[PDB]
């Protein structure tokens, strides 16, 4: 993925403020609430039966934190997303059989959560840079399908 | 298909736009044009520079149509028939672009209305925009 | 959204299914399970072997539900409410799977009713099955 | 690059009976009729205003012949679909900006056309082998998006 140096600084500056305890769990939680069929991949996470239950679920928060850390690792290796995510792509494609459209949905849910947390700081140019990142992450996740 | 709760979620959240209709619609279009440059090819006759007056005025038309859709949430095919004629019959917009604009509208709402944009309301808004999108990409006359 | 011509096409073509309901339904299921094996995991306790009586009986249930949907094409949310309870609330079926089964239903219809499966009828059947899929995958209560 | 040997034998055997002059125009025509927004990509092709006008359009039939030629090229090189379609991927993705969901739709329309022509000979196992072909073709055409 090609960010301009101006885009890279804006992305990096925003990401450095991200609440790593909550943002990932809110993104995974919203995925589970807005696209309920994704709950089928998380049968062992306990109570997913209501929106409040999903968002407050400690297993959702803990797993979302891992998601966010995967995005953080992608941000730090934009030149080699395919190799950064090869292990995760094997997991999500060969083992879990996640439909790659869901990779895209989760990336866009993350964008909504960033907009939600940062308000007007999440400008259209900042979003545009983040859309290049999440498209790049989602494609790397899907590589073992290609 | 929208539940009774979906409908009241949408009316409450979209009702907060108010006098920000043009600002928010224009912002959603700007986010779309900047994040997904291929969508610009439907507007080749437009001035699409940032802050363009044409984009601002167009953003208001979009917002107001959504307001009308919210008011006619139980009979959208009837209320939106003129817009379907434009987007499905004449412009032949690929449905993927409706997903892009819907996403950018959600982003705009999250950025401006954080108290409104709860997980359940986010879910209802997504279903609402998807249903609007289906009407505008369907040829049903 | 279905046009009057869409509704006319669907009723005429599906009316030609008749007594072949269970047969075509079971064939479409078998085509889906074989072409898209991940769909089998929605049925973890089924006998999905070739020619299984269970899949025969299930294809009959699918086909009959579609016949019901055809009869209520202007009333599908009300008519299919129990099926939405099952597929959207309990099973939480990923809508991509409804695209797979819908395609396999069109393949089955094209293979058995070539004279009926014209481009216009194909188009109308696709929209109809997309509409059914939206109802079954949406939680609207 | 992964059809089984039995799937390759099935697709090869059926494809030997396919009318290379008709099936492509029928598939492209039905794409334009069933998914009418695709007509926008063919502004210069003339009358596309009704099903009969689409299926009777000489430019649609002639283009459909080129489409099917490229599918034939893919079927003759089933383990190198990416290289077979590389140049078409640049055209469709970089130049024409066709959303890759449309590649999957055309693939399944082709499967419907095969089903329509062959009837009961288009058995579930034959279809399943062809689903892997058209999925691979669509993935190959989308490669420049990956
Ligand atoms: C698109 C970006 C995504 C990223 C960056 C991501 C990241 C991760 C990470 C880091 C793990 C932990 C793996 C490990 O510890 O070995 C994981 C596991 C998992 N992912 Fe994702 N994921 C994504 C999309 C998805 C989607 C869309 C789904 C399903 C709808 C999904 C389903 C799962 C499941 C079921 C697990 C295993 C959870 C468990 O341990 O039970 N992933 N993912
Ligand atoms: C998703 C919800 C959408 C809504 C509510 C909407 C609403 C509208 C409205 C109200 C108009 C002006 C109609 C008039 O002349 O009074 C319009 C025009 C237009 N729309 Fe949309 N639209 C949507 C999606 C899209 C998308 C996704 C695209 C393309 C990416 C698009 C492309 C256009 C174009 C090209 C025009 C004509 C502009 C002009 O030349 O005046 N629309 N739409
Ligand atoms: C045209 C679309 C569909 C129709 C009309 C349909 C209709 C039906 C009907 C009538 C039943 C039986 C309900 C009952 O026994 O009370 C059923 C059950 C079921 N369906 Fe579907 N269905 C469709 C799509 C799908 C898809 C795409 C999937 C998954 C890939 C699916 C998964 C299931 C499952 C798991 C059951 C329950 C089986 C059991 O445990 O007894 N359905 N459906
Ligand atoms: C998925 C399998 C597809 C295959 C194998 C395929 C193959 C081809 C071939 C062989 C050509 C001729 C290229 C040349 O000689 O320059 C072509 C051109 C073209 N294709 Fe496709 N295509 C596919 C999908 C699509 C789809 C889904 C669309 C649009 C929705 C599309 C839009 C076009 C256009 C606009 C042209 C240029 C036609 C012209 O104006 O001369 N293609 N394709
Ligand atoms: C009525 C409707 C349109 C789209 C949806 C939906 C529910 C979950 N995902 N999409 O419902
Ligand atoms: C009512 C309905 C079902 C599917 C559609 C459609 C046509 C084009 N895009 N979506 O409309």
């Amino acid at each position: 993925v090609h960010l301009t140096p101006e885009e890279k600084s804006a992305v990096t500056a925003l990401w450095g403020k991200v609440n790593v305890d909550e943002v990932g769990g809110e993104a995974l939680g919203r995925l589970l609430v807005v696209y309920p069929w994704t709950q089928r991949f998380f049968e062992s996470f306990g109570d997913l039966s209501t929106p409040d239950a999903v968002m407050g679920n400690p297993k959702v928060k803990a797993h979302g934190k891992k998601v966010l850390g995967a995005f953080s690792d992608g941000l730090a290796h934009l030149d080699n997303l395919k190799g950064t995510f090869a292990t995760l792509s094997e997991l999500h494609c060969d083992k879990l059989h996640v439909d790659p459209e869901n990779f895209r949905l989760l990336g866009n849910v993350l964008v909504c959560v960033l907009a939600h947390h940062f308000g007007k700081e999440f400008t259209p140019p900042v979003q545009a840079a983040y859309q290049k990142v999440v498209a790049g992450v989602a494609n790397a996740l899907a590589h073992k399908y290609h | 298909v929208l539940s009774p709760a979906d409908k009241t979620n949408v009316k409450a959240a979209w009702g907060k736009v108010g006098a920000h209709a043009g600002e928010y619609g224009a912002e959603a279009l700007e986010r779309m044009f900047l994040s997904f440059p291929t969508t610009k090819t439907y507007f080749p006759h437009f001035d699409l520079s940032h802050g363009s007056a044409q984009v601002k005025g167009h953003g208001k038309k979009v917002a107001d149509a959504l307001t009308n859709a919210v008011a006619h949430v139980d009979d959208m095919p009837n209320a939106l028939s003129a817009l379907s004629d434009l987007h499905a019959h004449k412009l032949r917009v690929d449905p993927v672009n409706f997903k892009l604009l819907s996403h950018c509208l959600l982003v705009t709402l999250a950025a401006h209305l954080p108290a409104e944009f709860t997980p359940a309301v986010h879910a209802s808004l997504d279903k609402f925009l998807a249903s609007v999108s289906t009407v505008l990409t369907s040829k049903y006359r």
Side-chain angles (χ1 to χ4, degrees), chain B residues 17-122:
Chain B
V17 179
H20 301 267
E23 179 198 348
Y24 289 3
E27 185 182 326
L29 289 170
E30 291 175 344
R31 295 181 175 280
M32 189 185 64
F33 292 141
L34 281 181
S35 296
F36 313 102
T38 53
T39 65
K40 290 153 101 178
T41 62
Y42 292 90
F43 298 86
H45 56 293
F46 264 42
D47 179 350
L48 293 180
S49 50
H50 176 63
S52 141
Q54 193 165 22
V55 173
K56 304 289 185 180
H58 198 63
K60 163 86 170 141
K61 298 184 200 178
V62 190
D64 288 352
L66 287 170
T67 298
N68 180 62
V70 168
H72 289 99
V73 81
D74 290 334
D75 73 321
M76 288 200 292
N78 192 28
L80 308 181
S81 64
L83 290 179
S84 176
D85 188 55
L86 177 51
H87 289 85
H89 295 256
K90 300 190 188 184
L91 295 171
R92 293 160 303 171
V93 183
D94 188 314
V96 72
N97 297 289
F98 281 80
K99 299 184 179 295
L100 300 178
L101 178 58
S102 296
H103 168 66
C104 289
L105 282 156
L106 292 182
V107 169
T108 303
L109 290 175
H112 286 275
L113 297 177
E116 306 302 328
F117 192 80
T118 70
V121 167
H122 176 179

Side-chain angles (χ1 to χ4, degrees), chain A residues 82-97:
Chain A
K82 156 221 172 307
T84 295
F85 286 107
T87 291
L88 282 171
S89 182
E90 297 171 318
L91 171 61
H92 284 85
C93 302
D94 305 333
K95 296 301 166 201
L96 290 176
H97 303 295

Side-chain angles (χ1 to χ4, degrees), chain A residues 22-34 47-62 109 113 116-117, chain B residues 117-120 122:
Chain A
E22 303 294 332
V23 161
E26 289 177 27
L28 178 61
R30 282 175 186 267
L31 183 80
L32 296 168
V33 167
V34 175
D47 192 9
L48 302 178
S49 61
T50 71
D52 283 344
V54 169
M55 308 301 295
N57 191 309
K59 285 182 182 187
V60 174
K61 288 206 176 180
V109 169
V113 171
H116 194 211
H117 278 240
Chain B
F117 192 80
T118 70
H122 176 179

Side-chain angles (χ1 to χ4, degrees), chain A residues 28 31-32 35 37-45 63 65-71 73 85 87-88 91-92 96-107 134 137-139 141:
Chain A
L28 178 61
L31 183 80
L32 296 168
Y35 313 100
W37 54 89
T38 60
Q39 298 176 15
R40 286 186 60 91
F41 291 88
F42 296 100
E43 196 191 343
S44 68
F45 281 29
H63 200 64
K65 199 174 171 158
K66 299 186 196 177
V67 191
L68 201 68
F71 278 95
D73 294 346
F85 286 107
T87 291
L88 282 171
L91 171 61
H92 284 85
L96 290 176
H97 303 295
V98 184
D99 189 278
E101 163 74 350
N102 293 309
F103 300 152
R104 203 191 57 81
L105 301 174
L106 179 52
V134 294
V137 169
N139 173 70
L141 257 289

